[PDB]
Amino acid sequence: ARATAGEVEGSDALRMDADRAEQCVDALNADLANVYVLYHQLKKHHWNVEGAEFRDLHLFLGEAAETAEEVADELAERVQALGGVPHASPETLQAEASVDVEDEDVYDIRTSLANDMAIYGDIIEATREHTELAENLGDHATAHMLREGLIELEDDAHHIEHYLEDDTLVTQGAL
Amino acid sequence: ARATAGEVEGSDALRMDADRAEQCVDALNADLANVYVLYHQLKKHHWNVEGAEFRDLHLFLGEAAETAEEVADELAERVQALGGVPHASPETLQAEASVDVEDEDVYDIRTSLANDMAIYGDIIEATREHTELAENLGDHATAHMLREGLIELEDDAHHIEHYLEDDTLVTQGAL
Amino acid sequence: STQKNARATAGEVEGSDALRMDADRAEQCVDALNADLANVYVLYHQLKKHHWNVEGAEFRDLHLFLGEAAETAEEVADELAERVQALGGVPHASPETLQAEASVDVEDEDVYDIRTSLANDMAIYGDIIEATREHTELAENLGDHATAHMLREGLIELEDDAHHIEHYLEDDTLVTQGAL
Amino acid sequence: STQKNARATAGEVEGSDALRMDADRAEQCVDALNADLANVYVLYHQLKKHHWNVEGAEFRDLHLFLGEAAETAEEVADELAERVQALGGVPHASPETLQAEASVDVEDEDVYDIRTSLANDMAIYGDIIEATREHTELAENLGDHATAHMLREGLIELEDDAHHIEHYLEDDTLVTQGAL
Amino acid sequence: ARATAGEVEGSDALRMDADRAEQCVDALNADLANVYVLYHQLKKHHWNVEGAEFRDLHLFLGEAAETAEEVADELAERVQALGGVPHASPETLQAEASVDVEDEDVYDIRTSLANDMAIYGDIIEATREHTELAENLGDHATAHMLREGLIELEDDAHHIEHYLEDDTLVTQGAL
Amino acid sequence: ARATAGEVEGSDALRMDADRAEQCVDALNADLANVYVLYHQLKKHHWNVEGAEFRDLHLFLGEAAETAEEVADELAERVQALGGVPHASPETLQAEASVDVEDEDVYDIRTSLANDMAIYGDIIEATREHTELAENLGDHATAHMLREGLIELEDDAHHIEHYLEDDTLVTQGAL
Amino acid sequence: ARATAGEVEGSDALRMDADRAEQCVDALNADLANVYVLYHQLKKHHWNVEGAEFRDLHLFLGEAAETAEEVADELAERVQALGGVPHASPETLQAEASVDVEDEDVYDIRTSLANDMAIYGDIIEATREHTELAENLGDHATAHMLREGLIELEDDAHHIEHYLEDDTLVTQGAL
Amino acid sequence: ARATAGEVEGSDALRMDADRAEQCVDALNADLANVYVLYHQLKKHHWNVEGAEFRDLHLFLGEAAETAEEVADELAERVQALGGVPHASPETLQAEASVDVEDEDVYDIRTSLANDMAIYGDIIEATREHTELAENLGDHATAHMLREGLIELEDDAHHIEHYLEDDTLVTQGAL
Amino acid sequence: ARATAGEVEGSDALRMDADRAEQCVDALNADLANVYVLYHQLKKHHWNVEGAEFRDLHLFLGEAAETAEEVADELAERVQALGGVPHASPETLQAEASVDVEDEDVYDIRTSLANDMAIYGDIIEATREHTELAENLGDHATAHMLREGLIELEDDAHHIEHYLEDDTLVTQGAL
Amino acid sequence: ARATAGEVEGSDALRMDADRAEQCVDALNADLANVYVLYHQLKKHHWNVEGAEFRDLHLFLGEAAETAEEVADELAERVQALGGVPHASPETLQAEASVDVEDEDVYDIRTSLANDMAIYGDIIEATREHTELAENLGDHATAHMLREGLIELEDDAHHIEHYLEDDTLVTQGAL
Amino acid sequence: STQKNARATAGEVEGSDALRMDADRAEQCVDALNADLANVYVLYHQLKKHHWNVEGAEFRDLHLFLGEAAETAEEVADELAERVQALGGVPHASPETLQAEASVDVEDEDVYDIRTSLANDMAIYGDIIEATREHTELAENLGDHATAHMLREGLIELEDDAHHIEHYLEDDTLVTQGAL
């Protein structure tokens, strides 16, 4: 084995001793697993959303899933750069995720979206925490990447919140 | 006149005798008719869609019309390449169409969409039969082009079906 | 006079020698275009407002529509301002001035539902379209065909937005009581 | 029944009236495509894993290859999932489900050397290719030529990746004992 | 009314209670109004700049105005995401702006630019302050967006400073 | 010879008899001449501009030449479409031009620019009259194309006028 | 030597045993040779076409060469992937082709294009059988590629048939 | 006046003394004049070409004009850079050209293209000598530019020779 | 002299008094010199890398050098914006660099890369330090730019680390 | 036959008599042969490269084949423009080639590469002689095109030479 | 010898067998190109310097011009370095080496006004152009037409920059005492 899950060696290139590195890696791994379940649930909703607004949502959800995917990729790579091993198999990603994930049934779009927003909220707070963690270890690259992915995660979280708001152009009339 | 409607001459270039070619031509030209009436009816719905979801549907139906148009173009070009005469005038297209065609009035969006979905379904079933028929004649290029257009037609048809499904983000609350 | 600090005084129109447009004709266009610039920039700010705030089942489509509609208004206002300058006048500039010179009705700072918001934008669009229609004839009658042509170029875009908001507000939807 | 909260139950296939595919035929494809989706999404996660972790003399070329190969798998899985939905079934979704429904062999969480990792991806690719080959005939025999065509479109890409990993693993190199 | 100017509800999606949110929203709103007057004064100068260097300045000022516009947009959207109401009408934006705004006369380019730079300076210091505010509330997305717009605002502020410096290629000779 | 300079034949395709067409042709061909001499003189100024602002003016005059060239192209094509013979040789272009044309020496930038501005102004006034003349003949396409070229010519002319205005960032200080 | 011409080892990666693989290979290589001489012949005709319609044909022939080149590449790369040795040197490619190839003199453009046409037809018929062969061996990726290359070949052969058709805008008049 | 036609001051920047510079200038200007009348003649032919092959020739002639235009620009800009005055007005350009220019009547397309061809050949031979001249003066940048312009001129002259070649897809049959 | 090396005047535009500014400028200048030696050593290795993996490394090293170049540019510009003078001549950049730089011999790729990674490590730690410096002076733009360049510098540092890891696809077998 | 292989007619358009043209033609056609066999052999190596570095080499050899192909195209077009007949069939290309051509077996990568490098070297030396020969005939366009292709051929040849050099990131450690 | 650690020694030229250029001819080009690389890289650093620092009425146009002019020099130096390597020599690399091997005059670390700065760049450009002119003949006389052609490709760009700086410095301007 080149590396053992859970081993964190830091990096001589990046002058981050294993001690500091393992504190970021533990936090980014936790992020990774959550963000990857988020991606797979966004994919799910993307695939399955139906009804009057489905095309727009479909497009939104596919974009959102692309954005979680990229954030996952940046996390896992950071992990590795810090001498860690990013969670990889689907089983591992779900087991190490703390966020709640829907069972295999398909739910209606409102429920589906409120479940996604719950996920985002938990990721967003965790992420805020890890960025202060990274800055306090002086890992400013990690903190900068966490904030760069945060602002995209909150923009999708906020979109979803707007989808779920109590307004519409529909009227009883048109019904 | 350089060629007479209905005639099929095959093609020496393509090493397709008129007797095989007539078989695919008669099938392709009937596809052409139905696709071009589909194209016109999508155009109609694109122009006329109104209401809470209209911009999205407007784009979608635009794109589906462009897809229909390109399919029709490929079918007509293929008919010509096999030495046949592709149906051309709008009056002939509609007259050769087997699918149902709305009258000039403008129906509401769910009615229009369900009318389009029924046209898609007839086109999809005929296309499936035509691809078999082309493979059986060893006209693999034809069969191929039919599959390549089929998967586009099926994706549009499936999107319409999603639009019509019984889900929505709208709640009585928001109404 | 040689000694104002101001390069130009608000309200002065000086025509252009480059453009062979004397001050007399210029003033007639610049009066029209300034008044439009003011309305189109309040339109732009209200569309932004509605882009920012729209929520609910159709929000993302509206959010993008309304941002594109603000962009178009922005571009229209930029043309009209540049035209007023090219004609030797002073385009309305500060936000206060722009709203004060606008004749359209502007929402107060509360956020309303999307149908109310769209209806209010619709109303501004219409005012601007009737006015732009007038100003184009005005400009053609002055022989200022550049300005006329520009007014029509921007009119076609404003009417396209206005008409989209009209469709958004129409009584139809895919939604059924069933799926409710 | 009118009263499940679930819009759809995992494992139900309902065909599509749009697509003129009754539930009987649909179920046969959706069974095949679901099983593929599961394998292709575990493939995708393992390629990502190997993209993340590859190191050594050839790492940057492999890192880019393996990221492009994950992207392709991702796109393949997205097609297959969308197809399963279009056919009125429920594509496997959660990571746990996807791995549980995968028949391919997946590496444990340790990181292995690049030859071991590539070999393991190679093995998944092959399984997926033999299966996809079957499913394409399956689909053509059902007259579901759209699905068949899509399976072939994605098969050509998967085979191209599989074959590249084969070349990466071949016994040749520019490296000489000399330069060692 | 869906929302009242001045109301700040936080966001459940973004796990930001109204208490913390109202401290960012108050600061971003203040920013918004200033940045929107800045945009309208940049537009003004863009439109009106004349003389030997006017084309370059025109281009620079239009770019600068585009950049303030985008920053405004990111601010107002953040505000909304935080459950606030971003200042919207032109009247409101100018009244809530703290920066000084030129009267409707047109001034020469040097004066015009020195007035713009004053604006930028006030926005830049405010923005620095709000970013420490956001980080201290642990709103790291807001802080990250503030810094992302800061660095573009200081780059334009600095350009303007260079335009106004005491150098030129011109010589008495050439005059 | 396929056609003789001066002749105008109208066009059957365009349903424009030679008697209406001659009227627009004589106007368009006089525009063509003046625009092509404008184009050459902009080229000249583009090649020769020197001094503190030269790169900017160099680009500008380049672009304005390209605009002039495209206008000339549209005018000449239109003349041809109306069955006329567009003036072609450089000697004929200049000879048919009514505008003033610098001699071969190179003047300073303000002189050159003011010479161009005077050419623009003559072209703008003639274009305005030609558009009226075309609308009055019911040649709306012509009138349209003239308006579309006019607004470009007017914007270049206005830019030159801005260049010549009595403002600058330069101060005696910096000198 | 790493591999010997004519040997075909299949592929473990693609789960194609040597037996099935030798079948597709022997067909794909014989295509490869024909398609590469086609490529060189189109290049020839591309280089040499002269006369009234030369620039158009020059562009079409260059494109048709490029299409043949890419078909050749896909063929050869498939052969390799199946564990075979694609024919490589020019003399091997012409020796293994079954199509007729013009001698090194240059023929007028009708004769040249008629000869290409003969070449396309032969390739097209071969490709059709090979697609059937690959499908029958269950080598779907190979069949799918041959169909993809086929529709481009057929499009080309068909364009050449149109070039050669007995119509023209020319009239005696214009002679 | 800033510079006087015919004067050539060299360049200190380019370390080209007036003597060497006057040599390249006198050659480049005489190219400039010829290439600009070439440009206007191609424009003419572009505008006027009619008949069976007109759209293709129209596109080729427009491109060939654009190529000549850019060659002219590079020539004139080099002259300027060498401290000379590039010929500018249309009447100067035709007066200083040594090529033959068609009168203002419109000739059929063979005659028109034969005349262009005469013009290209003369320019091509001149350019060849000038490249030799520049190299001999050690003015490598000038020679390198002339070669770069030359290969594009030659490509054009050669296309015209192909247009005029005695072949065609037309047959009596089709007449 | 407009400015003296080492003088730092702050900026009125950016409301950064010279006192605070000189603390960032001193730190960014140190960064600049190091990052510019890094760029010149990356260029070196880019140019000279040979052997089995050279093309990929070449591409990687040229990209890395482009990224250091951009970071240098952002540093030097910040310096200037803060009223400082960025180190400019090559001599000055090397003298003020603290990182070790290879002599003019060419070393093998492994050695070359391990020398580069040493450089990156020193720059990365310095950069982390300066970002906390900038944040503590409330220069949040500087801190934001430092982090934006940090994350690219650590990504290259980490790549290099991966190149140097003890894995390969090579086997004794293949040797 | 429109032209007979070997004949060279020069060109009137290009003012190149057959006696000068034959000299460049005989040289260009021998280049063409060797370049097209180079192209085929690069194709071969592209298809067949395997092992630790294969993807990179695969791309490289692909690109170098495309470069070879474009060089061959330019050489053949030039031969045609000078009134010669470019060698066309694959059998003639190889037969006219003076370079060595692998037999059909597939060699290992270092052997293949060194075989290509030897073909490059013969082509580079001949090209150098041909450029001299073209300049001496005053065929500057030819000489130019040869230099423009030479520097591409030399860069590919130099890249192959880099691939073959005795360095690597691989260590016995990693083995 | 088998045992230097250095792969190549600075100053050694070994020709290339790939390029069929023996060491004797190569050395003559590599001497010329190295000397140019050094000057062009000091040019690049001084243009950067002036891009960074230019201020005043025309600064943004100059800032962009001078950044594009540095980019071109950078690209020129990269060609020349790669060429020196391709010819089996060792391109000057460290900043110290590059300036030490440069024959051009380089500004001290103070910032001068834009006319002084431009004049100083102009002076470097000229040196480089006269030298490049020589080296191109040198290379053609050696029959190294690739190098000659590359020298001319980069010469045309350097002369275009040099000539632009010449225009920037010319005695003309739109500015009048009036507007002063």
Ligand SMILES: [Fe+3]
């Ligand atoms: Fe769907």
Ligand SMILES: [Fe+3]
């Ligand atoms: Fe994605």
Ligand SMILES: [Fe+3]
């Ligand atoms: Fe990645």
Ligand SMILES: [Fe+3]
């Ligand atoms: Fe990584």
Ligand SMILES: [Fe+3]
């Ligand atoms: Fe690692």
Ligand SMILES: [Fe+3]
């Ligand atoms: Fe970013």
Ligand SMILES: [Fe+3]
């Ligand atoms: Fe970004």
Ligand SMILES: [Fe+3]
């Ligand atoms: Fe609420």
Ligand SMILES: [Fe+3]
């Ligand atoms: Fe509509």
Ligand SMILES: [Fe+3]
């Ligand atoms: Fe369409």
Ligand SMILES: [Fe+3]
């Ligand atoms: Fe279309």
Ligand SMILES: [Fe+3]
């Ligand atoms: Fe078509």
Ligand SMILES: [Fe+3]
């Ligand atoms: Fe036909």
Ligand SMILES: [Fe+3]
């Ligand atoms: Fe056809």
Ligand SMILES: [Fe+3]
């Ligand atoms: Fe396709």
Ligand SMILES: [Fe+3]
């Ligand atoms: Fe249902």
